[PDB]
From a paper:
However, we were able to solve the first VRR-Nuc domain structures using single-domain proteins derived from three bacteria and bacteriophage as surrogates: Psychrobacter (psNUC); Streptococcus equi bacteriophage P9 (stNUC); and Salmonella enteritidis typing phage 3 (saNUC). Crystal structures of three representatives show that they structurally resemble Holliday junction resolvases (HJRs), are dimeric in solution, and are able to cleave symmetric four-way junctions. DALI searches show that the structures with greatest similarity to the VRR-Nuc domains are all Holliday-junction-resolving enzymes exemplified by Hjc. As dimers, bacterial VRR-Nuc domains have two active sites and a DNA-binding surface with 2-fold symmetry that are well suited to the recognition and symmetrical, bilateral cleavage of Holliday junctions.
stNUC was solved by single-wavelength anomalous diffraction (SAD) methods on crystals of selenomethione-substituted protein and refined against native 1.3 Å resolution data. The protein crystallized as a dimer with monomers related by a crystallographic 2-fold axis and interacting through a substantial hydrophobic interface formed by the central β sheets of opposing molecules and bounded on either side by the α2 helix from each partner. K47 is presumably involved in positioning the catalytic water molecule as would be expected from homology with other members of the restriction endonuclease-like superfamily (Knizewski et al., 2007). PsNUC bound a four-way DNA junction stoichiometrically with an affinity indicative of a subnanomolar equilibrium dissociation constant (KD) typical of HJRs (∼1 nM; White et al., 1997) whereas stNUC bound the junction over 100 times more weakly (KD = 200 nM). Nevertheless, in both cases, the binding was structure-selective, with psNUC forming weaker complexes with a 5′ flap and a nicked three-way junction and stNUC binding the four-way junction only. stNUC and saNUC exhibited weaker nuclease activity against the Jbm5 HJ substrate, detectable only at protein concentrations above 1 μM and with increased reaction times. In both cases, we observed a range of symmetrical cleavage sites within or close to the homologous core of the junction as well as some nonsymmetrical sites away from the branchpoint. stNUC also selectively cleaved a nicked three-way junction (RF) and a 3′ flap structure (3′F) 2 bp 3′ to the branchpoint.
Numbering used by the authors:
A (entry chain A), B (entry chain A): -1 to 90
The structure:
């Protein structure tokens, strides 16, 4: 019925980001994170999931490539987790 | 005839990046940089131009938004400028 969805979480991330929260598409590459947050401390990758939903294996594989190149990826699935992710970025 | 083009410069950037060099598209937003370089020191924006060509005003306006949010944007238009940009990122 009225449980929050992935799109709700994504809209909340956009609202709370102090900086830019740009949609990220990368033609030809599978599984890239939904958003790139641009703020004073860095540009950060964020994948948004519906409450309780894990990234698919193709998404995890892409996150691993990002981590191997040396950067982190946040996965958010609730307003609380959005708040925590943004706070961590603000303290990076 | 055989002068390097924007695509040549972009291919060279991809070849020389120590990390990921992901195509960046952001549906609904005009003028975003061509590529996001992911390496140990950060995730960085790069716009690629043909030799001697300046970013269009809509691209400059987007770069300004990125800079106001607190991050830099590199503009590369030659193999030399690619080398210099990547070296600066490796030293970030
Ligand atoms: Mg998602
Ligand atoms: Mg270009």
């Amino acid at each position: 019925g009225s449980m929050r969805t992935e799109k709700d979480i994504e809209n909340y991330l956009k609202k709370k980001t102090k900086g830019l929260c740009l949609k990220f598409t990368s033609p030809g590459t599978i599984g890239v994170p939904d958003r790139i947050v641009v703020m004073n401390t860095g540009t950060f990758f964020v994948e948004v999931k519906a409450p309780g939903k894990k990234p698919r294996p193709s998404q995890v594989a892409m996150h691993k490539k990002i981590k191997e190149a040396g950067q982190h990826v946040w996965v958010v699935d609730s307003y609380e987790s959005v708040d925590m992710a943004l706070k961590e970025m603000e303290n990076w």
